Amino acid sequence: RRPWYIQGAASPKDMLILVDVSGSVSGLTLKLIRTSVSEMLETLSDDDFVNVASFNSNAQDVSCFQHLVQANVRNKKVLKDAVNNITAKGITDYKK
Amino acid sequence: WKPFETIILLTIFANCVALAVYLPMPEDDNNSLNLGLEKLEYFFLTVF
Secondary structure, eight states: OOHHHHHHHSOOOEEEEEEEOSGGGTTHHHHHHHHHHHHHHTTOOTTOEEEEEEESSSEEESSSOOSOBOOOHHHHHHHHHHHTTOOOOSOOOSOO | OOSOSTTHHHHTTHHHHHHHSOOOOSTTOOOHHHHHHHHHHHHHHHHO
């Protein structure tokens, strides 16, 4: 998980994180999903671009961002705080 | 007066399985089998 290791292990990334917020994920798996997405965001640096979306019968951006952003400490802060506000309700639609 | 009572207690046993295979899910979620058995309810409701 060190920046130097992650830098020398692979090339930059265009990551999109798609988080399921249907009702079935409510409870323990939602709490684990929030912790998991924060940990996943911590393996990203300033040469990677990220956005976190969300879907349950309708897909939307989890944040204010609306496209891929540079994944610096401020943008990752925005995305982590937007992910911690996630709730679970609805039907699942993997196609949307 | 016909054997119209073993037809009825054998579709009463069919509505006992359309209740057992139903999977209850949280916060307003479903699957395909759950939505199929909400069609069988109309059948059982127009037979009884």
